[PDB]
Amino acid sequence: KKTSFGSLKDEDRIFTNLYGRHDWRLKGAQSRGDWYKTKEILLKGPDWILGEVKTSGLRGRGGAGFPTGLKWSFMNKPSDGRPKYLVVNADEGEPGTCKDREIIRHDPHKLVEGCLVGGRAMGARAAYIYIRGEFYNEASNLQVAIREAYEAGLIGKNACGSGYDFDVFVVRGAGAYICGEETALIESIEGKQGKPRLKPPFPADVGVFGCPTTVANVETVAVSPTICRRGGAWFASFGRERNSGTKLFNISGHVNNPCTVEEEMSVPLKELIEKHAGGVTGGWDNLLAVIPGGSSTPLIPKSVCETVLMDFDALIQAQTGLGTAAVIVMDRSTDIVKAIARLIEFYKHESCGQCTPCREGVDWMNKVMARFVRGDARPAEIDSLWEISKQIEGHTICALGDGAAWPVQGLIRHFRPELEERMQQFAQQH
């Protein structure tokens, strides 16, 4: 098999206009292989399409990483009289993550074709693309592409000549990171506060407008056309088993050249930072910690970053997660407690307030963390903060509560000496 991963070639990259160096409109997209034999794919049938996705090993790129083929097949059932919808999650809210922005504004026609191919697999009549309101220019690029597809017969009535009717609607958010959560996104489309729903029912049974729905990430949907064209087996030839394919990575923070890049799954974290981002500022030995998969994932110290691979299973073993694969790098000049405290301040501002452990708990954690930044606390409070975070985790309606507990747990797990040392400094001034 393949024992080492990385060094992906440009022939096997999916998002070939990641940097907008080529034309993003239909003329460019068609020249790059989009919208090619889309009729053939549609007439092959939903079950064949779901087979290519199941075999590809594709997992959700939104942050939870559920196997996409299995998830999308929940809609593969007879209609009971309700319409069926595909919702594309373009809310891109997780701090550090900006991968979905590049697909929307530079490769919009892969998204539009992904909606059709993915929508057909589920038997949906339309796709709603929820894009955060701040991406005003990107959403306007996406509407231009949709108009081109409508005018070329690629979507709408009898899309691509397949005899299948499909509409692509774009709906903008109004400022809320919580509206990226799948059920909070659905409540937002329906015109309510972006407050998540409890489960059951699951969206595949009762979703947007009370109808069967599948919420899929922009990247998950956008790669689906190519997986069908080139085959699921070709996609599964990348990355470790159960960690298949090509992933978009955002390297930001204390790196020489922060950038977005497409690289093979299971690539070593060290290789990804040095090969593409130009290394850690001040050299690798200046590394202090990395948040691998966006602010919701716990940080890992330099010792773990030395050998860790970038996939779902590798990072779970390192007591974290792949998340959105947004790598925030912190060199030894960083005030680590402050950096994580600013992340809890973010979740405090983004909690919807619906359910008690997050409404009260996250705000509680923010107040404690602010005091930890100054050391104005006692060492006994570190274990209190750990216990408090454990009361939020797994007791909330949605995973935002979990995503606020994890960064706190990661800091306490790997940087407890820093916390206690700071407290000693504060006390000796007082």
């Binding site: 907008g20 160096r21 509407q143 949709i146 108009r147 409508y150 774009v170």
Partner: protein, 44 residues
């Protein structure tokens, strides 16, 4: 020829306040008729 040295996403520099909603209005003639729940609203 093949050029990989220029940015080809410059149209949005000319976008304005109503670009998105104007594009939405233009797309209306292509849409399929919307499904109905059978009443004007949940309050009917």
């Amino acid at each position: 020829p093949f050029d990989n040295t220029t940015y080809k996403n410059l149209q949005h520099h000319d976008y304005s306040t109503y670009t998105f909603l104007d594009l939405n209005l233009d797309l209306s003639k292509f849409r399929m008729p919307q499904p109905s729940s059978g009443r004007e609203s949940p309050r009917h």
